[PDB]
Design a protein around this ligand. Sequence first.
Ligand SMILES: [Zn+2]
Lengths: 47, 1890
Amino acid sequence: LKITLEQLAKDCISKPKMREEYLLKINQASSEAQLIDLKKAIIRSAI
Amino acid sequence: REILLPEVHLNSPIVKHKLYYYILLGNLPGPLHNQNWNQIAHEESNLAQRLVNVRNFLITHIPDLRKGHWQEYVNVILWPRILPLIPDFKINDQLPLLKNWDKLVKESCSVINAGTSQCIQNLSYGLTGRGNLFTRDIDLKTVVAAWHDSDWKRISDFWIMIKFQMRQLIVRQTDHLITYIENREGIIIITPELVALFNTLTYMTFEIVLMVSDMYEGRHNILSLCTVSTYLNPLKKRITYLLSLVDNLAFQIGDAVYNIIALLESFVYAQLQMSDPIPELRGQFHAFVCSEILDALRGTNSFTQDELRTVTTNLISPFQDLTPDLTAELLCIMRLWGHPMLTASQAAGKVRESMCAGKVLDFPTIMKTLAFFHTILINGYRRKHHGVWPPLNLPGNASKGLTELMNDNTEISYEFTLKHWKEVSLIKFKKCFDADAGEELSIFMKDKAISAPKQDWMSVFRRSLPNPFNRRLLLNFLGDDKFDPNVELQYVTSGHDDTFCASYSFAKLTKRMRSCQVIAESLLANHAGKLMKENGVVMNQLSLTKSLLTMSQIGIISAASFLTTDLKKYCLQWRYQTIIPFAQSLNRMYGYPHLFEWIHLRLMRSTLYVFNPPADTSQFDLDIFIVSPGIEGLCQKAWTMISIAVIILSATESGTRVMSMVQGDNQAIAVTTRVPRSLPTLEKKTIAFRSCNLFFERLKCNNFGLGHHLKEQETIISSHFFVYSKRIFYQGRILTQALKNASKLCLTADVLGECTQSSCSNLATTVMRLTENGVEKDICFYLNIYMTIKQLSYDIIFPQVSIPGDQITLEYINNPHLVSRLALLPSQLGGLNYLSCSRLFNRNIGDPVVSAVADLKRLIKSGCMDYWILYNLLGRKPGNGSWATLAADPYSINIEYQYPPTTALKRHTQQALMELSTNPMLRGIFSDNAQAEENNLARFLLDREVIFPRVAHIIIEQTSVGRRKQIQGYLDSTRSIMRKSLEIKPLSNRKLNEILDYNINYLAYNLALLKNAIEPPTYLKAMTLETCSIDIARNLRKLSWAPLLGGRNLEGLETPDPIEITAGALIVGSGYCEQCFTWFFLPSGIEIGGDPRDNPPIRVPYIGSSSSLKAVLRLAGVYIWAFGDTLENWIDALDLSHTRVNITLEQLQSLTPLPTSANLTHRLDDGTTTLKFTPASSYTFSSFTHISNDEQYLTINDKTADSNIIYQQLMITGLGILETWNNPPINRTFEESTLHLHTGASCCVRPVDSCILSEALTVKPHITVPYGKLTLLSQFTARQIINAITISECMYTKLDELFMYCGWELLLELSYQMYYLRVVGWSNIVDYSYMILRRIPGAALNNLASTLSHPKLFRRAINLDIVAPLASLDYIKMSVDAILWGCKRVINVLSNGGDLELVVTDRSMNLIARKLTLLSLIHHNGLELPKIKGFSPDEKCFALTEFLRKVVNSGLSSIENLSNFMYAAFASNNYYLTRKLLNSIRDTESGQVAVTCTNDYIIWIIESNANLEKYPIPNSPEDDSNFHNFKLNAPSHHTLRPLGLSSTAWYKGISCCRYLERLKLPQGDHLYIAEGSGASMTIIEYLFPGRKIYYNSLFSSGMPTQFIESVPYKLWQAIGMTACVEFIINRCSLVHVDLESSASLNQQCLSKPIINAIITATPHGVLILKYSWLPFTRFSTLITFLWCYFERITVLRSTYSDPANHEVYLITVSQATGMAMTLTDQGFTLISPERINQYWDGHLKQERIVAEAIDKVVLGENALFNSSDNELILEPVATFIEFEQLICTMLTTHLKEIIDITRGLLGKISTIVRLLTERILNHTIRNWLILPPSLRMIVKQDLEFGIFRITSILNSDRLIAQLTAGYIRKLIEGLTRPIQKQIWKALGCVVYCH
Ligand SMILES: [Zn+2]
C-alpha cells in the first residue's frame, strides 16, 4: 500500500527533501509494478 | 457459602444468547427468537421478578420513563469502551474501605522503605559494588507511587468492588434477594446475574464483569510496569494511543474490530519483517497485512478511502523505530481487549463452510507421500532398534528393494525413494507388528468431555413445545464393570450404530466412542510416536528448547532462511478419501483391525451441531446444524505425522539441509546450504532467500496437491524470524515476551480452593517468571514486595467471605508495621515471600531452608528493624506433624500451616474417588489403612542414629505404596469433577471447619509471631550473631523436629546458598580485586549491527546444563548404600522387592547381581511426566561469554555432581550477574570486563562426612496384585574412553599401553570402514588417521582435560617419550597425536606379532571383530594382490582363509606365528568390570613401579632503544573451555626450601642475587613495594649493601615478620591506585614489586612503573618485577609498554614455580603516550618473536631437572651449597622402627573408641576419623626415613594424587574389636592443596634435618 511504502521510505532514506519529493510522487504514483520499482530505488538509494 | 465460591476469573465463553435472554425476559428497552414471555415468566424463574423490580425501581428513578425518542436514554450494548471509561462511578467520595486500603499500603511501604534500598545496595557491594546499571533513581516509593499515581486504577478498584459484591450475591443465591443502590448521577443495580451502569445506560451479565475487570486490571498493571525507567515513554505513548484509538474505533463500528484484533496481532510481525538485508519482505508482508485489514474494516461502511487511510496511519503510528523486543511486548499487550460475545450463527457457519469445497483428490501426491511415510517409518524403526523392519510384502516392483531388504540395509535413502512409486504396503488381515494395546493406565483414567445420545437438544437446554444426563467418563469409568480396551476395540471393529452425536461447544462425543478415541491416541503416540525425525519434540523442556534455540543458532554464523506458518483449517479440511492409505497401513501394522480411521469415517454419515429456531424438529434434517464435513483435534497425531511426510517430500523435491518443528497444525522450517563462507554476508542472505523461496513454492504446490487451502495469511518467511507457540526467536535469542506475564499479575489465586498462601505463591512465580526476561532484578524484588503487601492488604480488608468476628483482623490492620514484618520473611520458613531473592539467580534450588535463613540473616543485617524474630522462630512452638508427614517431604520444617487446602481438598477428592470402585484388580490399589502403612514405613526409616530424608523419600516413592500413591495422585482435579467428587458429601464437618476458615488461623499463627516473644537464653547466644546460614538451618530443623524425633539431627543435604558463599568482584579496564579462584570473562562485544563474523568472539552459548523392576533396582541400590553389606539390610531389600515387585514372577534370586553400585553421591532428581512445557526460559547475552575454571576449586576426585552442583550454581550466578549488568538496551559501550569470584572467605565450607548404620523396626507392607599383569586396565580404559569419541582416575596406575590399545581399537573400526579403499601400511594409515582424527573437538576437549593434566601423568608420558610438545603451550594436539603414536606403535605390533587376544564387550559382533582384525592385517599385509568385498558374515572370513593360504608363500615376519594366525575373551558390561577391577587392584601390589640449584637462566629480553617489531603470532591455545588444566596443582617443589618459615620464597631471592652479582649495579637503598610478610627481600640486604631500607606493605586489614627477625638487631649493633603511590613518592636505587590478577586486555599497575621513573628521578638503577605470561598477549603488552624510556631489560626464569608457565622475574614525554602506544599496538605489534622457543626448551629442561630433584629427595641427598647460605640468617616427636606396630596400636585404640561412643552442636565421628588419619599421616611423615622402599614409592604416589591409601591394610588383622565392626575394610579405604604443600615441606624438613 501507498502509506506502507511511505513509512518504508521515511525509515530508509536520508535527505528529507528528496524523501518529501518521492513521497509527493508515490502518493500520485499508482502502478504497483512501478511501486516495486520505486521501492527498489529507495533501497538502493541509501548510497 | 457452604464450599468453594465460584470462579473469580473466567474460563467459559461469553455469548449473546444469555444476555439477550435475560434482558428480554425482563421488560427493558433482530434476535434469533421471538417466542413467549408470560408463559416462561410463569415457568419458575424469579428472574422476571428480580428484573421487573429492577425496571420499576429505575422507572421511579429515571426522569424519562416513556418519552418521545429517549433523549439521553440509550441502551448502548454495542460494546462501549469509552463509556466504561466515562466516570460511571467517579463520585470522588470513595467507598470507605478502599481509603483504608490506600492508607495501609502506603504506610507499610513507607515504614519498610529505607531499609530495603540500602539492603540491596549492600548486596551489590557484596557482588561487585554498585550494581544495577543503566545509561534518575529507582526505589520502593517510586513504585508504589506510580502504581497509585496512575490512571485506570480507581476504575479497576471500582470493578473489583463490583466483582466482590456480585460474588457475595451469588453466594447468597447458593444459600438464599438482590441489590438496589442509589447515588448521585448514577444507578447501581446489582443482581447475581446482571449489573447496571448509568450516570447513557447499559447492562452487563456475569461473565462480562469478569472480562472488564481483567481488562482494566491488566492495562493498569501494564502502564504501571511501563512507568519504570527501563522501558520508558516510548511504550507508554504506544499503549495509550493504541488503547484510545482502538476504543474509539470499537465504539464507531462494533464487533468487526474484534475480528481485526486478530488481524492486528499478526501486523507487528510485518514491522518485525524489517529483515533489512533481504528485500521484498517488507513490501510483501507489511503490504499484505495492511491491505487485508483495510478490507476487514471497509467491509462495514465507515468510509472508503480518506477515513481508511487516516485510521490506518494513526493505527500503525505506535510502530516506529523499535527493535524486536519492544515490538513483541507490544503485541503481547495488544491482546488485552477481551473476547467478543459469541453466537452460534457465525462460527457454526464457518465450520459448516468446511463442507464440500471440491472433491479434488490427487492420487500422485498422496501416493508419493504415503511412500515417504512408509520410508520414514522404516528407517526410524531401524534406528530405534538393533533393527529388523520386517515387512511381509513388496512382491511388486523392486529388485533393488530385494537387495536392500534381504541384506537388512540399516539405511534407506530419501533420494533413493523419490525415484520410485509404491514402495511398500504392509496390507493384510493376519496379525500385529511392533505394537501392543491395553497399557499406559494414565489415559483412560483421566477424563475429558462427553456428549449425549440421540435425544440431545432437550439435554442441551429447555424451552421446547426430555431429560438431562450430565455424566462424565470419569464417574462411569470408575463405576464401570468388565471394561477393557479389548472389548473397546471389539466395539471399534463393530458397528454404524445410532449412538454417537458429535457435539461442539472444542468438541465432545459419547462414552464408548471417546474411550476408543483416547485408547487410539495413546497407542499411536506411544508406540509409533516414538519414531521421530526432524523434530526435537521428544521431551518437554531440555531437548525442545535447545533444539529450537540451536536451529536459530546454526542459522547464525561467525543459513539465513527461515519460515513458519500457523494453521487451523488443517484440522477441518481433511477427507476420508485422502487418508485411508495411512489408515490401513498403520492398521495392519498394529494388527487390530480398522482402528485408526473409524472415527472420522463415521463423521461422513451423521449430522452435528453446536438456541435452535424450531417449527417441529427432532431428527435428521438437511441444513444451526451441519451435516458431515474434518474434525478439530481428534487423532491430530496422524495429522502431524503426515505433515512431517509432506514436508520431507518437499525437502527431497528440492535438496537442502532442512530442520523443522511441526505439531498440531503449526510448523516452522529452517534451511541452509553449502554456501561459500567467505564473501560478505548480505548476498549470503540473498542465496539463502532464493533457496528457501523455491522450496516454499514447491511446498505450496504439493501441500495444495494433497488438498489444503494454505494461503499467505497463515505463513511468514524471513532470514531470522522463527516463531512457535507464540514465542518468537530473532537473531538467535528468545524475545523478551515479558509484558504479557505483567498483565497476568492477577489479584487472587486459582479458581478452586481459596486461600491466601497459594495465591501469593502463584503471584510470586508469575513475577518470578517476569524476572526471567527483560526487566532488571531490583525492580522485580521491589515489585514482589509491593505485590505481596497489596495482596495481603486486599485479603485482610473486606475478606472475600468477610466476617468481622475475630480481632485478628483489627490487630493486623491497625498497624502497618505488622503486615510488612509478615511479608518480609521467606515463605518456606513461614510468611508470604516465596523465594524471590535467591531464586532471583537460579531456577534450580538446592535447598530452600538454608536459602530461607540466608535471606533472613541478610535482610536483618541490612535491617528490616526486626532482630529478635530469629530467636522467636528458633524458640517457636515445635509443630506436631507426623512420621509420614516428614517422610513425604525432605527440606521440611515442622510448622503448623504449610499446606493450603488445595492439596488437602484434592487429596480427599482423589481418595473419595477411589472410594468409587468396581474396576479390575485395581481393588488392592486402594486400601483403607494406606496412611497407616506410610507411617509404618516412616517409623521403619527414621527411628535411627543417622537419618537422611531424601533416602526415605525416594524409597517410599519406589516401593509398593509408591505406585498406589502415584496412581491415586494422577487423577482429574478440575472444578467439574471437584463438585462431582463432593457428590461424596460427608467428608466431615470437622474437616469442613478446618477448610472454610483456613486463612483466619494462618494469620492467627503469624500473629503468634507478634512483637517479641520469650527468648531461650542458652541457644540464643549459642546461635545468634550471625555466623552461617548452614548452622542456623541445622539447629532450627533439629529443634523443630525434636518433638517427634528428639535428639538426632537429620543430615544428608543442605549445599549452601550462593549469595552467602560467593562474593566476587568485577573489573573493567583498570581494576584490582580481593587477593586470590574462578573467573568469567567478557570481551568488548557489540550486539547486531556490524558483521556476525566481525562480532569479536565465537558464539558459545550456555544454559542450565523390563518394567518397574527398574524402580525396584533403584530401590535396592539406594537402600543398601552399596557398602554396608549385611544379611539384614539385604534381606530388607529383598522384602521391599517382594513388596513393590508385582509385575512378573517375583524376584527370588539370592543376591541381586544386575543392580550396580550408585550410592557414591546424591544424584536424585525427578520429573519428566508431561509432553511439553511452554514458558521455557530467557537469556539474551550469555553468548559472547567465556567461562574458565582454571583456578582451584576441585582436583581429581569421585564427586560426580557432588560439588559440580555448586559449581553449576556459580556458573549460573556469573551468567546472571553479567546479564543483569547488560540486560537493558545496550551496546559495545562496555570495555573488556571480567568477574573474579574470589570466594575463599566463605563463612562455612563444612567438609563432607561418611559412616554406616542399620535401621531395625521390622515392619512389612502387604499387597499382591498385577503392578598377574594388569594390562586389562589399559584395555578397559581404552574401551571406555575411545568409545566416547567413537577424569584421570583409572588412568593413574597405567602406562603407554592405554594409548596403544585405544589406537588399536580405532584402527580396527576405521579399517573395517576402509572397505578395501587403498590404505598402505604407514603412509596412508597416517594420512587417513589424521584426516579422521582432526575433527569433532568436543570429545577431544574432554579427553584432553581428562588425561593431559597437571599431575606427573603428562610428566610420565613425556619422560616415556610418547609425544613431542614442540606460543607453543598447546595441549589438545598432543592428546590426539598421543593416539597417533599408539597407532604407530600398533603397526609395529602388526609388523610381527598376533598377541593380545582381543576381547568382546554377541557372536555376530565378535566374528565381525575377527573380520576387522584380519581386514587391517591384510590391508597392510598385502602389497602382492588386491581383495574384494562381498557378504557380511563369512565372506571376509573366507577372505582371511584364502589370502592367508596365499601370503603364507610370501611373508616378511617369522613364519610360525602366521600359522597361529588361525587363532576371543568375553565381557558383559564396561562399568561393572572397569570399576570392580580398579577397586580389585586396591590391595598390596607394587606392579606400578614399572615407571622406575643454579640451573634457571635468562632470556635477556631486548637491546637498548630497539624498534624492529616482528611477526606477532599472538596465537593462543585453549580456544574452547575444557576442564581446569593449566597450572593448578604440582605441590612437589615445595620440599626444596625446608625452613621454619611460612614464605620459603627467597630461593628465588638468592637466584636474583646470583643474577645481581652477575652484573654491576649502583648504590644500595632497597625499595620494597607493598609485598612481604616475612619474605624474600631480606636476602638482598643480607647480600647487598644498605642502611635503613625503604619499604612498605599493602594496606592490610589487621609489619614484616622474618625481616625483623633478620636485619634490625644486626643494624642496631652499631596496594596503590592514586594516593598511596603519592605518599610512597613522598617517602633512588633498586626497587622490588610483585603482583598478579585476572584476564584483561590492558594494564592496571603502571602506577609502580611511573613510581620507579619519578623515584629514580628524585640515575639508572635497575628494578625487579614479578610477572608471568599466562595470557602472553598481556605480557607482551607490558613488554611493549616498557620498550619506551628503558633499555637492556632482562628477565630470568625461576625454579620455585611448578612445571608450568613461569612466574618469571624481570629486572617518550608522558605515560599516557606509552599506554595508548601499546594499546593501539594490540593491532600489529609483538616484540618476543624468537627467544620464546629457547624459553620453552629451557622450561622443559627445568621440568626434567625438578623431576631429578624429586628423585633425589626420595633419597637422603640434598640441593646444598645454598641451603646453608640461607640458613646463615634463617615436628620433633619420637621416631621408631616399629611405627608399624605403633599404627596397629593406634588404630586398635581408636576403633575401640568408635565402638564405645556409639555403644552450636556437633556431628558424631567424621571429625575424629579425619583427625586419626591425619595424625597417622604426620607419624609416617616423621618416620619417612624408616622405609620399606616399596611402601615408600607407594605413599609417594598417594600423597601425589592417590592420597593416603592406608598401608597396614590386612596385617592389621591382629577378634572382639573386629567382630564389633566388620566394615573395617571400608574404614581402611576412605589431599587438599594447602595441607598437601604443608606436608611436602614437612618431608623436606625431615630430609634436611637428619
Ligand atoms: Zn557459610
